[PDB]
Design a protein around this ligand. Structure first.
Ligand code: NA
Ligand code: NA
Lengths: 438, 431
């Protein structure tokens, strides 16, 4: 039997785009983010946290305007501070003067997602905790002290995960910063918690399981071909065969893999001019990616069978900056301009599909989509255009999966033809469409 | 020039007795206190903190009934949990469901003290913080991260001290667990904070300064003689000896403190509430022997009291404390006769021949410890006989002796370093 997505993985492929919102205490410190420093220098005064104009509806609407279907918030990251009303991590919103210690930004956030029709997910950082002395999943120290403290920390994390999985409705994903390591060793035993309380939630990830994989870079792209199948049911370097070039495997997948671990692409929005910022920092207004760059990334992520996650940055007032929001809207508008209305479209469970265009006209893009619930069946394909009554090949490829965007030098054509020359089962093509884009 | 107390040290001597109340999360765990394990292992669920019957007025009332004139609360101890509304330590009453995260036991406590006329003080336990993995101020780990956390923790201590010294009025004392060490090394730089915001608060203690010294045991007694003077302005390094007697020739005023848990009987010695200790409170007669060997030996006595998981001083403890105050009053409130003077000799005429078995002597402590050798004689059948002999007097000396049928008692100071200033020479007969 062909590998196929589990039922709860269909929403991963179908979403195509989502957003992650990073927010922690250092956003309010008036200086740039230094990751190395932040992980090992506990915050001096947590009352710098004071987003007096906080509005998670504005965050969600801003992401939605780009085409995002899901949105994720960092409940914790590296400081140890938690953006919810926790009864186990005292270093949370209960501690601060803002909102009289009764704020719960995770709640505001999941409510906003649902209000606008985006599926909410939660990111949890357990790998680094500057307050509590955790570095690369490990409680610092030695001997009985460290063994006992590690056992305690694992339970603390289990309890935090339990709160987040039981008090905020059904979640799209749980994303752990760098995963949740190994439950038989330093990592918390979180998979059973997510399975019990969040059976349809994407679990991302630990040594035993990843419901999707990081595509090998934060460029907002994957490589080509890009398959959803994978040799192991996780993305952990300790579980991939030792002779494999692992980054190449993340970037491409393994067409012969027996596990469904589909590709994720990600990038901060604020990645221009030599910056690469997951958090809001001063003087980065003009470092948002241009629309043309975002479109290149879209075509090389969503158009290469990977769901794309954009990193968005609420500011110290509690809002997505105006410029960022405008750029996001421009991205969504441009995706719609290019691809919402094809010249023609056709579908079928066939190895060949001919798209008649109605009249001779210009064509420079095609979209092909397989019915992903039934697997990646297409292994080799070609697209031909009928130009002056003669078929000529305009492109060739391998993987299709959920979505393939092909762009080629424009031709005046009366028809396009998709031929699947190699396949492991009868292709189930839900979309073969042509476009003319200037 | 004789050493003398500082103006703010007078209230130390004058108080004579006080109470310290220990309270931390492990009180609520249903099992006995294990210091070694509590220090190291973090509390698994801090919501066990739910004293539904909490009333600090009851704590203060209970202590007042024993004769306590000051009361001290552990704002923190070893878990790192803080019993106030802190803006720097997030592991405090803001974190719990109890009182909807708005409780402030330090505030309740200082208000209660003032309501009942007891002077409030605060104990700050900072050597150990189990939440944060701090062991004698040190953070664990081999590198920059551990050094950073250790320096950050020192600042946290300084900030908590600042909150406690600025938001709760004037304090009687600030008590640092085992002292706050050396601010040039691992200790927090807390003396300048206390000096700035609490200039008349007893500072106890660090390498540079101790406003009083621990008498060397937790027996509720000091040895005799017991002098307030000391060779250094602190209690930091026979040390146990020096703590036990002081130094009559010392240039610094570092007066003696005696302490004991109330729950110190039957092999137990408990500063915290634990289950099944109700019968381990000290008998009244034993508490009185201790009072005579602390207060009656120029040492202010601190009783360790234990609020329970409901938030009250247990009923049996409160009754025993009342019994103690009542008995101090019964024995010493009404003398047969009393006299005072700036003299080397004072005679107490009794009024009629009658039995006598106790005397109290008190120097005007603001003027120092002038008496060095003294004797008390009783006039029995018209002839003087010596009933006791001593050295140090200080704020208060209690002498108990085999009863004699006397018509007068006479105090003679045979050796002194300045004219004695005796505010009280009294005789009693206690059945
Ligand atoms: Na910053
Ligand atoms: Na206990």
């Amino acid at each position: 039997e062909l590998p196929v997505p589990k039922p709860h993985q269909l929403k991963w492929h179908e979403a195509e785009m989502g957003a992650v919102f990073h927010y922690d205490l250092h956003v309010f410190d008036g200086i740039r983010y230094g990751q190395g420093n932040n992980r090992i220098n506990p915050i001096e005064d947590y009352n710098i946290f004071n987003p007096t104009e906080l509005n998670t509806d504005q965050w969600v609407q801003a992401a939605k305007a780009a085409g995002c279907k899901f949105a994720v918030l960092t409940a914790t990251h590296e400081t140890g501070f938690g953006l919810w009303q926790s009864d186990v991590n005292p270093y949370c919103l209960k501690a601060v003067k803002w909102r009289d210690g009764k704020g719960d930004i995770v709640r505001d956030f999941v409510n906003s997602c649902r209000k606008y029709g985006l599926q909410p997910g939660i990111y949890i950082g357990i790998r680094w905790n500057s307050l509590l002395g955790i570095h690369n999943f490990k409680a610092e120290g030695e001997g009985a002290f460290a063994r006992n403290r590690q056992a305690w920390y694992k339970r603390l994390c289990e309890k935090m995960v339990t709160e987040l999985c039981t008090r905020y409705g059904d979640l799209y994903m749980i994303w752990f910063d760098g995963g949740a390591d190994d439950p038989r060793a330093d990592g918390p035993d979180v998979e059973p918690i997510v399975n019990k309380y969040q059976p349809n939630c994407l679990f991302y990830h630990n040594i035993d399981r990843a419901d999707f994989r990081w595509g090998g870079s934060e460029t907002g792209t994957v490589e080509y071909p890009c398959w959803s199948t994978f040799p192991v049911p996780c993305s952990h370097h300790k579980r991939i065969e030792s002779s494999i070039d692992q980054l190449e495997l993340l970037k491409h997948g393994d067409k012969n893999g027996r596990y469904w671990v589909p590709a994720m692409a990600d990038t901060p929005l604020r990645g221009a001019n030599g910056r690469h910022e997951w958090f809001w920092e001063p003087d980065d207004e003009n470092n948002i990616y241009p629309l043309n760059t975002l479109m290149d990334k879209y075509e090389k992520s969503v158009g290469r069978n990977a769901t794309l996650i954009l990193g968005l940055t609420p500011d110290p007032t509690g809002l997505i900056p105006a410029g960022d929001a405008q750029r996001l809207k421009e991205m969504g508008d441009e995706i719609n301009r290019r691809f919402s209305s094809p010249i023609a479209r056709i579908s079928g469970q066939k190895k060949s599909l001919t798209l008649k265009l109605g009249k001779e006209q210009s064509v420079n893009y095609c979209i092909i989509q397989e019915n992903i619930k039934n697997g990646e069946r297409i292994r080799q394909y070609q697209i031909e255009a009928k130009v002056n009554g003669k078929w000529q090949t305009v492109c060739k490829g391998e993987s299709v999966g959920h979505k393939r965007i092909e762009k080629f030098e424009p031709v005046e054509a009366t028809a396009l033809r998709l031929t699947v020359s190699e396949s492991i089962a009868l292709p189930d093509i839900i979309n073969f469409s042509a476009y003319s884009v200037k």
